[PDB]
Design an enzyme around this catalytic site. Structure first.
Site, PDB file in Angstrom:
ATOM      1  N   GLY A   4       7.017  -2.632  -1.700  1.00 45.40           N
ATOM      2  CA  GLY A   4       6.477  -1.673  -2.442  1.00 45.40           C
ATOM      3  C   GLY A   4       6.513  -0.136  -1.984  1.00 45.40           C
TER       4      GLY A   4
ATOM      5  CD  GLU B 214       5.746  -2.988  -5.851  1.00 42.31           C
ATOM      6  OE1 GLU B 214       4.597  -2.243  -5.637  1.00 42.31           O
ATOM      7  OE2 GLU B 214       5.963  -4.017  -5.166  1.00 42.31           O
TER       8      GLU B 214
ATOM      9  CD1 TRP C  67       0.597  -8.999  -0.408  1.00 41.04           C
ATOM     10  CD2 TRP C  67       2.753  -9.595  -0.676  1.00 41.04           C
ATOM     11  NE1 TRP C  67       1.285  -8.397   0.502  1.00 41.04           N
ATOM     12  CE2 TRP C  67       2.629  -8.665   0.455  1.00 41.04           C
ATOM     13  CE3 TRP C  67       4.044  -9.995  -1.015  1.00 41.04           C
ATOM     14  CZ2 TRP C  67       3.805  -8.302   1.085  1.00 41.04           C
ATOM     15  CZ3 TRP C  67       5.234  -9.785  -0.373  1.00 41.04           C
ATOM     16  CH2 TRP C  67       4.908  -8.777   0.944  1.00 41.04           C
TER      17      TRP C  67
HETATM   18  C1  LIG Z   1       7.769  -1.245   5.901  1.00 46.70           C
HETATM   19  C2  LIG Z   1       6.370  -1.250   6.153  1.00 46.70           C
HETATM   20  O1  LIG Z   1       5.408  -0.459   5.805  1.00 46.70           O
HETATM   21  N1  LIG Z   1       5.647  -2.116   7.161  1.00 46.70           N
HETATM   22  C3  LIG Z   1       4.427  -2.422   7.383  1.00 46.70           C
HETATM   23  C4  LIG Z   1       3.878  -3.448   6.336  1.00 46.70           C
HETATM   24  O2  LIG Z   1       3.779  -2.943   5.191  1.00 46.70           O
HETATM   25  C5  LIG Z   1       3.387  -3.858   4.239  1.00 46.70           C
HETATM   26  C6  LIG Z   1       1.852  -3.922   3.868  1.00 46.70           C
HETATM   27  O3  LIG Z   1       1.658  -2.727   3.554  1.00 46.70           O
HETATM   28  C7  LIG Z   1       1.594  -4.882   2.729  1.00 46.70           C
HETATM   29  N2  LIG Z   1       0.256  -4.428   2.360  1.00 46.70           N
HETATM   30  C8  LIG Z   1      -0.657  -5.820   2.064  1.00 46.70           C
HETATM   31  C9  LIG Z   1      -2.011  -5.424   1.756  1.00 46.70           C
HETATM   32  O4  LIG Z   1      -0.225  -6.826   2.154  1.00 46.70           O
HETATM   33  C10 LIG Z   1       2.390  -4.313   1.491  1.00 46.70           C
HETATM   34  O5  LIG Z   1       2.352  -5.142   0.248  1.00 46.70           O
HETATM   35  C11 LIG Z   1       2.843  -5.045  -0.809  1.00 46.70           C
HETATM   36  C12 LIG Z   1       4.356  -5.150  -1.072  1.00 46.70           C
HETATM   37  O6  LIG Z   1       5.213  -4.419  -0.662  1.00 46.70           O
HETATM   38  C13 LIG Z   1       4.278  -5.302  -2.844  1.00 46.70           C
HETATM   39  N3  LIG Z   1       5.204  -6.652  -2.942  1.00 46.70           N
HETATM   40  C14 LIG Z   1       4.840  -7.397  -3.889  1.00 46.70           C
HETATM   41  N4  LIG Z   1       5.202  -8.508  -3.953  1.00 46.70           N
HETATM   42  C15 LIG Z   1       4.574  -9.537  -4.735  1.00 46.70           C
HETATM   43  C16 LIG Z   1       6.618  -8.709  -4.203  1.00 46.70           C
HETATM   44  O7  LIG Z   1       3.497  -7.340  -3.692  1.00 46.70           O
HETATM   45  C17 LIG Z   1       3.258  -6.177  -3.239  1.00 46.70           C
HETATM   46  C18 LIG Z   1       2.163  -5.855  -1.827  1.00 46.70           C
HETATM   47  C19 LIG Z   1       0.809  -5.834  -2.320  1.00 46.70           C
HETATM   48  O8  LIG Z   1       0.554  -4.450  -2.647  1.00 46.70           O
HETATM   49  O9  LIG Z   1       3.989  -4.671   1.906  1.00 46.70           O
HETATM   50  C20 LIG Z   1       4.323  -3.843   2.851  1.00 46.70           C
HETATM   51  C21 LIG Z   1       5.654  -3.988   3.150  1.00 46.70           C
HETATM   52  O10 LIG Z   1       6.476  -3.867   1.925  1.00 46.70           O
HETATM   53  O11 LIG Z   1       2.420  -3.636   6.957  1.00 46.70           O
HETATM   54  C22 LIG Z   1       2.363  -4.264   8.137  1.00 46.70           C
HETATM   55  C23 LIG Z   1       0.857  -4.647   8.509  1.00 46.70           C
HETATM   56  O12 LIG Z   1      -0.109  -3.655   7.814  1.00 46.70           O
HETATM   57  C24 LIG Z   1       2.805  -3.103   9.213  1.00 46.70           C
HETATM   58  O13 LIG Z   1       2.825  -3.519  10.528  1.00 46.70           O
HETATM   59  C25 LIG Z   1       4.148  -2.701   8.941  1.00 46.70           C
HETATM   60  O14 LIG Z   1       5.020  -3.903   9.280  1.00 46.70           O
END
Ligand SMILES: CC(=O)N[C@H]1[C@H](O[C@H]2[C@@H](O)[C@@H](NC(C)=O)[C@H](O[C@H]3[C@H](O)[C@H]4N=C(N(C)C)O[C@H]4[C@@H]3CO)O[C@@H]2CO)O[C@H](CO)[C@@H](O)[C@H]1O
Length: 343
Positions: free
Chosen positions: A75, A117, A324
Protein backbone atom coordinates in the site's frame (compact mmCIF):
# COMPACT_ATOMS: atom_id res chain seq x y z
CA UNK A 1 -16.38 -20.11 -0.85
CA UNK A 2 -13.10 -18.17 -0.73
CA UNK A 3 -11.70 -17.75 2.80
CA UNK A 4 -8.62 -15.59 2.31
CA UNK A 5 -5.88 -14.50 4.73
CA UNK A 6 -2.86 -12.23 4.23
CA UNK A 7 0.35 -12.95 6.15
CA UNK A 8 2.91 -10.11 6.13
CA UNK A 9 6.58 -11.12 6.12
CA UNK A 10 7.48 -8.21 8.44
CA UNK A 11 5.78 -10.13 11.25
CA UNK A 12 7.94 -13.28 11.00
CA UNK A 13 9.73 -12.95 14.38
CA UNK A 14 6.56 -12.67 16.47
CA UNK A 15 4.17 -14.52 14.14
CA UNK A 16 5.91 -17.08 11.94
CA UNK A 17 3.79 -18.84 9.29
CA UNK A 18 3.56 -21.91 11.57
CA UNK A 19 1.24 -19.89 13.86
CA UNK A 20 -1.40 -19.35 11.14
CA UNK A 21 -4.48 -21.50 11.68
CA UNK A 22 -4.69 -22.56 8.05
CA UNK A 23 -7.73 -24.79 8.76
CA UNK A 24 -9.78 -21.57 8.70
CA UNK A 25 -8.68 -20.55 5.18
CA UNK A 26 -8.84 -21.70 1.57
CA UNK A 27 -6.10 -19.30 0.36
CA UNK A 28 -3.19 -17.69 2.19
CA UNK A 29 -1.17 -14.83 0.74
CA UNK A 30 2.48 -14.00 1.37
CA UNK A 31 2.85 -10.20 1.52
CA UNK A 32 4.98 -8.93 -0.22
CA UNK A 33 7.32 -9.58 -3.10
CA UNK A 34 9.01 -6.35 -4.19
CA UNK A 35 8.93 -4.77 -7.66
CA UNK A 36 12.73 -4.21 -7.62
CA UNK A 37 13.01 -1.14 -9.85
CA UNK A 38 14.64 -0.38 -12.22
CA UNK A 39 15.07 -3.93 -13.58
CA UNK A 40 11.64 -5.01 -12.30
CA UNK A 41 12.99 -8.51 -11.78
CA UNK A 42 10.36 -9.21 -9.13
CA UNK A 43 11.71 -10.93 -6.03
CA UNK A 44 11.10 -11.46 -2.34
CA UNK A 45 13.13 -9.03 -0.25
CA UNK A 46 16.72 -10.33 -0.23
CA UNK A 47 17.33 -12.18 3.03
CA UNK A 48 13.79 -13.63 3.22
CA UNK A 49 14.21 -16.37 0.58
CA UNK A 50 13.96 -19.18 3.16
CA UNK A 51 10.83 -17.74 4.78
CA UNK A 52 9.20 -17.39 1.35
CA UNK A 53 10.12 -20.95 0.34
CA UNK A 54 8.95 -22.48 3.64
CA UNK A 55 5.66 -20.54 3.71
CA UNK A 56 3.54 -22.87 1.59
CA UNK A 57 4.78 -26.23 2.95
CA UNK A 58 4.38 -24.85 6.48
CA UNK A 59 0.79 -23.62 6.16
CA UNK A 60 -0.28 -26.76 4.26
CA UNK A 61 0.79 -29.02 7.15
CA UNK A 62 -2.35 -28.03 9.12
CA UNK A 63 -4.65 -27.95 6.09
CA UNK A 64 -3.15 -29.62 3.01
CA UNK A 65 -6.03 -28.38 0.82
CA UNK A 66 -5.07 -24.72 1.45
CA UNK A 67 -3.58 -22.84 -1.51
CA UNK A 68 -1.18 -19.91 -1.51
CA UNK A 69 -0.49 -16.78 -3.52
CA UNK A 70 2.35 -14.29 -3.41
CA UNK A 71 1.34 -10.63 -3.44
CA UNK A 72 3.50 -8.10 -5.25
CA UNK A 73 3.69 -4.50 -4.06
CA UNK A 74 1.90 -3.12 -1.02
CA UNK A 75 0.00 0.00 0.00
CA UNK A 76 2.95 2.41 0.25
CA UNK A 77 3.66 5.41 -1.97
CA UNK A 78 7.03 3.93 -3.07
CA UNK A 79 5.17 0.88 -4.42
CA UNK A 80 2.67 3.12 -6.24
CA UNK A 81 5.55 5.13 -7.77
CA UNK A 82 7.25 1.92 -8.91
CA UNK A 83 4.08 0.53 -10.52
CA UNK A 84 3.62 3.85 -12.34
CA UNK A 85 7.22 3.72 -13.66
CA UNK A 86 6.91 0.05 -14.57
CA UNK A 87 3.63 0.24 -16.41
CA UNK A 88 4.71 3.00 -18.82
CA UNK A 89 7.69 0.95 -20.07
CA UNK A 90 6.90 -2.02 -22.33
CA UNK A 91 10.30 -3.67 -21.82
CA UNK A 92 9.95 -3.29 -18.04
CA UNK A 93 6.46 -4.81 -18.15
CA UNK A 94 7.90 -7.84 -19.98
CA UNK A 95 10.61 -8.28 -17.34
CA UNK A 96 8.00 -7.98 -14.57
CA UNK A 97 5.67 -10.53 -16.15
CA UNK A 98 8.43 -13.10 -16.79
CA UNK A 99 10.01 -12.71 -13.34
CA UNK A 100 6.73 -12.73 -11.37
CA UNK A 101 5.59 -16.03 -12.95
CA UNK A 102 9.03 -17.56 -12.31
CA UNK A 103 8.91 -16.29 -8.70
CA UNK A 104 5.59 -17.97 -7.96
CA UNK A 105 6.81 -21.30 -9.37
CA UNK A 106 10.21 -20.97 -7.66
CA UNK A 107 8.67 -20.76 -4.18
CA UNK A 108 5.74 -23.14 -4.75
CA UNK A 109 2.91 -20.60 -4.78
CA UNK A 110 -0.34 -21.33 -6.63
CA UNK A 111 -0.90 -17.76 -7.74
CA UNK A 112 0.12 -14.13 -8.04
CA UNK A 113 -1.51 -11.03 -6.61
CA UNK A 114 -0.98 -7.36 -7.45
CA UNK A 115 -1.31 -4.78 -4.68
CA UNK A 116 -1.21 -1.42 -6.47
CA UNK A 117 -2.88 1.43 -4.58
CA UNK A 118 -4.03 2.83 -6.93
CA UNK A 119 -4.14 2.74 -10.74
CA UNK A 120 -5.25 6.36 -11.08
CA UNK A 121 -5.44 8.83 -12.81
CA UNK A 122 -6.65 7.59 -16.22
CA UNK A 123 -3.12 7.25 -17.68
CA UNK A 124 -2.17 4.93 -14.82
CA UNK A 125 -5.29 2.79 -15.31
CA UNK A 126 -4.55 2.55 -19.05
CA UNK A 127 -0.99 1.43 -18.43
CA UNK A 128 -2.03 -0.98 -15.65
CA UNK A 129 -4.43 -2.54 -18.16
CA UNK A 130 -1.44 -3.23 -20.44
CA UNK A 131 0.48 -4.90 -17.59
CA UNK A 132 -2.42 -7.06 -16.45
CA UNK A 133 -3.42 -8.10 -20.00
CA UNK A 134 0.18 -9.19 -20.67
CA UNK A 135 0.32 -11.01 -17.32
CA UNK A 136 -2.92 -12.92 -17.99
CA UNK A 137 -1.59 -14.07 -21.38
CA UNK A 138 1.80 -15.10 -19.97
CA UNK A 139 0.06 -17.03 -17.18
CA UNK A 140 -1.95 -18.99 -19.75
CA UNK A 141 1.18 -19.60 -21.86
CA UNK A 142 3.16 -20.89 -18.86
CA UNK A 143 0.34 -23.34 -18.05
CA UNK A 144 0.57 -24.65 -21.62
CA UNK A 145 4.37 -25.08 -21.68
CA UNK A 146 4.75 -26.36 -18.10
CA UNK A 147 1.62 -28.57 -18.17
CA UNK A 148 0.47 -27.32 -14.74
CA UNK A 149 -2.84 -25.59 -13.92
CA UNK A 150 -2.47 -21.88 -14.58
CA UNK A 151 -1.36 -19.67 -11.73
CA UNK A 152 -4.23 -17.85 -10.05
CA UNK A 153 -4.23 -14.09 -10.59
CA UNK A 154 -5.83 -11.62 -8.22
CA UNK A 155 -5.49 -7.97 -7.32
CA UNK A 156 -6.31 -5.61 -4.51
CA UNK A 157 -8.94 -2.99 -5.32
CA UNK A 158 -10.22 0.19 -3.70
CA UNK A 159 -13.51 -0.24 -1.82
CA UNK A 160 -15.36 1.45 -4.70
CA UNK A 161 -15.39 0.75 -8.45
CA UNK A 162 -14.79 4.46 -9.19
CA UNK A 163 -11.46 6.15 -8.49
CA UNK A 164 -12.77 8.16 -6.76
CA UNK A 165 -16.54 8.23 -6.08
CA UNK A 166 -16.52 11.94 -5.07
CA UNK A 167 -14.29 12.89 -8.05
CA UNK A 168 -14.07 10.32 -10.84
CA UNK A 169 -10.79 10.34 -12.79
CA UNK A 170 -10.91 6.66 -13.73
CA UNK A 171 -12.58 3.41 -12.72
CA UNK A 172 -11.88 -0.30 -12.57
CA UNK A 173 -12.76 -1.96 -15.89
CA UNK A 174 -14.88 -4.79 -14.50
CA UNK A 175 -15.35 -6.86 -17.68
CA UNK A 176 -11.58 -6.74 -18.28
CA UNK A 177 -10.94 -7.77 -14.67
CA UNK A 178 -13.49 -10.60 -14.69
CA UNK A 179 -11.93 -12.01 -17.87
CA UNK A 180 -8.29 -11.81 -16.75
CA UNK A 181 -8.44 -12.43 -12.98
CA UNK A 182 -9.79 -15.12 -10.69
CA UNK A 183 -11.07 -12.52 -8.22
CA UNK A 184 -10.37 -9.14 -6.65
CA UNK A 185 -9.76 -8.40 -2.99
CA UNK A 186 -11.98 -5.43 -2.13
CA UNK A 187 -10.32 -3.28 0.55
CA UNK A 188 -13.58 -2.40 2.29
CA UNK A 189 -12.01 -0.60 5.25
CA UNK A 190 -9.82 2.37 6.29
CA UNK A 191 -12.74 4.73 5.65
CA UNK A 192 -11.96 6.64 8.84
CA UNK A 193 -8.95 7.10 11.11
CA UNK A 194 -6.79 9.51 13.11
CA UNK A 195 -6.29 11.73 10.05
CA UNK A 196 -9.82 12.95 10.98
CA UNK A 197 -10.45 14.88 14.21
CA UNK A 198 -13.57 12.86 15.08
CA UNK A 199 -14.07 9.16 15.83
CA UNK A 200 -15.79 6.94 13.28
CA UNK A 201 -16.29 3.35 12.14
CA UNK A 202 -13.22 2.57 10.01
CA UNK A 203 -14.87 -0.32 8.14
CA UNK A 204 -18.60 0.46 8.41
CA UNK A 205 -20.71 -2.04 6.47
CA UNK A 206 -23.37 0.64 6.05
CA UNK A 207 -24.34 4.09 7.32
CA UNK A 208 -27.30 6.49 6.97
CA UNK A 209 -22.24 8.32 4.78
CA UNK A 210 -21.14 7.09 1.35
CA UNK A 211 -17.87 5.58 2.66
CA UNK A 212 -19.15 2.08 3.47
CA UNK A 213 -18.41 -1.49 2.45
CA UNK A 214 -21.93 -1.97 1.07
CA UNK A 215 -21.85 1.17 -1.11
CA UNK A 216 -18.49 0.05 -2.51
CA UNK A 217 -19.70 -3.49 -3.21
CA UNK A 218 -22.89 -2.09 -4.80
CA UNK A 219 -20.72 -0.01 -7.18
CA UNK A 220 -18.79 -3.05 -8.47
CA UNK A 221 -22.03 -5.02 -8.96
CA UNK A 222 -23.76 -2.08 -10.67
CA UNK A 223 -20.82 -1.84 -13.08
CA UNK A 224 -21.31 -5.52 -14.02
CA UNK A 225 -18.73 -7.40 -11.93
CA UNK A 226 -19.81 -11.02 -11.49
CA UNK A 227 -20.53 -11.28 -7.74
CA UNK A 228 -18.33 -14.37 -7.34
CA UNK A 229 -15.30 -12.30 -8.49
CA UNK A 230 -15.60 -10.06 -5.39
CA UNK A 231 -13.92 -11.00 -2.11
CA UNK A 232 -14.90 -8.76 0.81
CA UNK A 233 -12.01 -7.40 2.88
CA UNK A 234 -12.27 -7.32 6.66
CA UNK A 235 -9.55 -5.80 8.85
CA UNK A 236 -7.94 -7.61 11.79
CA UNK A 237 -6.82 -4.24 13.13
CA UNK A 238 -8.62 -1.14 14.35
CA UNK A 239 -8.01 2.56 13.86
CA UNK A 240 -7.39 4.50 17.06
CA UNK A 241 -7.79 8.09 18.19
CA UNK A 242 -6.96 10.19 21.23
CA UNK A 243 -10.17 11.75 22.56
CA UNK A 244 -10.53 15.48 23.11
CA UNK A 245 -12.79 14.83 26.13
CA UNK A 246 -12.95 11.59 28.14
CA UNK A 247 -16.74 11.88 28.65
CA UNK A 248 -17.42 12.03 24.88
CA UNK A 249 -16.84 8.42 23.89
CA UNK A 250 -19.29 7.52 21.10
CA UNK A 251 -19.00 7.65 17.31
CA UNK A 252 -18.48 11.25 16.14
CA UNK A 253 -16.66 12.29 19.33
CA UNK A 254 -14.00 14.98 18.91
CA UNK A 255 -10.39 13.75 18.72
CA UNK A 256 -6.90 15.27 18.89
CA UNK A 257 -4.59 12.76 17.16
CA UNK A 258 -3.63 9.13 16.62
CA UNK A 259 -4.01 6.61 19.42
CA UNK A 260 -1.69 3.63 19.82
CA UNK A 261 0.16 2.41 17.84
CA UNK A 262 0.46 5.43 15.56
CA UNK A 263 -3.26 5.07 14.79
CA UNK A 264 -3.50 1.28 14.29
CA UNK A 265 -4.05 -1.49 16.84
CA UNK A 266 -4.20 -5.24 16.19
CA UNK A 267 -7.33 -7.15 17.17
CA UNK A 268 -5.23 -9.08 19.72
CA UNK A 269 -4.09 -5.80 21.30
CA UNK A 270 -7.71 -4.58 21.27
CA UNK A 271 -8.64 -7.73 23.21
CA UNK A 272 -5.90 -6.80 25.70
CA UNK A 273 -7.26 -3.23 25.80
CA UNK A 274 -10.70 -4.58 26.77
CA UNK A 275 -9.30 -7.04 29.34
CA UNK A 276 -7.38 -4.07 30.82
CA UNK A 277 -10.61 -2.12 31.39
CA UNK A 278 -11.69 -0.65 28.04
CA UNK A 279 -15.43 -0.79 27.37
CA UNK A 280 -16.54 -2.52 24.17
CA UNK A 281 -19.58 -1.23 22.27
CA UNK A 282 -21.26 -2.81 19.26
CA UNK A 283 -22.63 -0.19 16.87
CA UNK A 284 -25.59 -1.62 15.00
CA UNK A 285 -25.98 1.49 12.80
CA UNK A 286 -22.62 0.85 11.10
CA UNK A 287 -22.17 -2.87 11.91
CA UNK A 288 -18.91 -2.35 13.76
CA UNK A 289 -17.38 -2.18 17.21
CA UNK A 290 -15.47 0.34 19.24
CA UNK A 291 -13.76 0.35 22.60
CA UNK A 292 -12.56 3.14 24.86
CA UNK A 293 -10.71 3.78 28.08
CA UNK A 294 -9.73 7.20 29.41
CA UNK A 295 -8.59 9.19 26.33
CA UNK A 296 -8.08 6.23 23.93
CA UNK A 297 -10.76 5.16 21.43
CA UNK A 298 -10.47 2.41 18.81
CA UNK A 299 -12.89 1.35 16.04
CA UNK A 300 -12.63 -2.22 14.75
CA UNK A 301 -14.47 -5.40 13.82
CA UNK A 302 -15.42 -7.89 16.53
CA UNK A 303 -17.01 -11.33 16.73
CA UNK A 304 -20.51 -9.94 16.02
CA UNK A 305 -19.61 -7.50 13.23
CA UNK A 306 -17.45 -10.09 11.43
CA UNK A 307 -20.28 -12.65 11.49
CA UNK A 308 -22.63 -9.97 10.10
CA UNK A 309 -20.17 -8.94 7.38
CA UNK A 310 -19.58 -12.55 6.34
CA UNK A 311 -23.33 -13.24 6.15
CA UNK A 312 -23.70 -10.00 4.14
CA UNK A 313 -21.09 -11.31 1.69
CA UNK A 314 -23.02 -14.57 1.46
CA UNK A 315 -26.33 -12.73 0.88
CA UNK A 316 -24.71 -10.52 -1.79
CA UNK A 317 -23.49 -13.73 -3.53
CA UNK A 318 -19.84 -12.70 -3.24
CA UNK A 319 -16.91 -15.06 -3.82
CA UNK A 320 -15.95 -14.85 -0.15
CA UNK A 321 -13.97 -12.72 2.28
CA UNK A 322 -10.39 -11.85 3.16
CA UNK A 323 -8.59 -10.79 6.31
CA UNK A 324 -5.73 -8.29 6.48
CA UNK A 325 -3.64 -9.40 8.31
CA UNK A 326 -3.54 -12.75 10.07
CA UNK A 327 -0.70 -11.92 12.49
CA UNK A 328 -3.02 -9.32 14.05
CA UNK A 329 -5.44 -11.93 15.46
CA UNK A 330 -3.01 -14.32 17.13
CA UNK A 331 -5.73 -16.64 18.51
CA UNK A 332 -7.60 -16.58 15.17
CA UNK A 333 -10.82 -15.46 16.88
CA UNK A 334 -12.25 -13.62 13.88
CA UNK A 335 -11.15 -16.11 11.22
CA UNK A 336 -12.95 -18.81 13.24
CA UNK A 337 -16.28 -16.99 13.41
CA UNK A 338 -15.98 -16.07 9.71
CA UNK A 339 -15.40 -19.68 8.68
CA UNK A 340 -18.22 -20.92 10.93
CA UNK A 341 -20.58 -18.26 9.55
CA UNK A 342 -20.08 -19.14 5.89
CA UNK A 343 -20.39 -22.85 6.74
C1 LIG B 1 7.39 -1.29 4.23
C2 LIG B 1 6.76 -0.91 5.54
O1 LIG B 1 6.21 0.17 5.68
N1 LIG B 1 6.83 -1.81 6.52
C3 LIG B 1 6.26 -1.58 7.84
C4 LIG B 1 4.89 -2.27 7.91
O2 LIG B 1 4.00 -1.60 7.01
C5 LIG B 1 2.77 -2.32 6.82
C6 LIG B 1 1.69 -1.79 7.77
O3 LIG B 1 1.67 -0.36 7.73
C7 LIG B 1 0.30 -2.31 7.41
N2 LIG B 1 -0.72 -1.65 8.22
C8 LIG B 1 -1.66 -2.31 8.90
C9 LIG B 1 -2.63 -1.46 9.68
O4 LIG B 1 -1.76 -3.53 8.91
C10 LIG B 1 0.03 -2.09 5.93
O5 LIG B 1 -1.17 -2.75 5.52
C11 LIG B 1 -1.86 -2.39 4.32
C12 LIG B 1 -1.26 -3.05 3.07
O6 LIG B 1 -0.04 -2.45 2.59
C13 LIG B 1 -2.38 -2.91 2.05
N3 LIG B 1 -2.52 -4.11 1.23
C14 LIG B 1 -3.58 -4.73 1.50
N4 LIG B 1 -4.02 -5.83 0.94
C15 LIG B 1 -5.27 -6.47 1.34
C16 LIG B 1 -3.31 -6.50 -0.14
O7 LIG B 1 -4.35 -4.13 2.56
C17 LIG B 1 -3.69 -2.91 2.84
C18 LIG B 1 -3.30 -2.89 4.31
C19 LIG B 1 -4.31 -2.18 5.21
O8 LIG B 1 -4.42 -0.80 4.89
O9 LIG B 1 1.06 -2.73 5.19
C20 LIG B 1 2.34 -2.13 5.38
C21 LIG B 1 3.34 -2.72 4.38
O10 LIG B 1 2.84 -2.58 3.04
O11 LIG B 1 4.38 -2.24 9.23
C22 LIG B 1 5.21 -2.85 10.21
C23 LIG B 1 4.48 -2.85 11.55
O12 LIG B 1 3.87 -1.58 11.78
C24 LIG B 1 6.53 -2.08 10.27
O13 LIG B 1 7.40 -2.66 11.25
C25 LIG B 1 7.20 -2.11 8.91
O14 LIG B 1 7.59 -3.45 8.59
Amino acid sequence: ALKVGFWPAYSVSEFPPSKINSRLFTHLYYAFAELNAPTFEVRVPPGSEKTAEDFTPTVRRLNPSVKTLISIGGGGSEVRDNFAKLNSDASARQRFVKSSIALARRYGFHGLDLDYEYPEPQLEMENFVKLVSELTAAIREEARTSGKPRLLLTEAVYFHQKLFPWEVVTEYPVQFIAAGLDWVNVMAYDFHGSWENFTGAPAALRDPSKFTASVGIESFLAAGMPPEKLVLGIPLFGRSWLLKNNNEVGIGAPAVGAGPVDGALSFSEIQNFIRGGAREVFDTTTVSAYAYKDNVWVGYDNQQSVALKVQYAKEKRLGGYFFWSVNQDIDAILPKIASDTWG
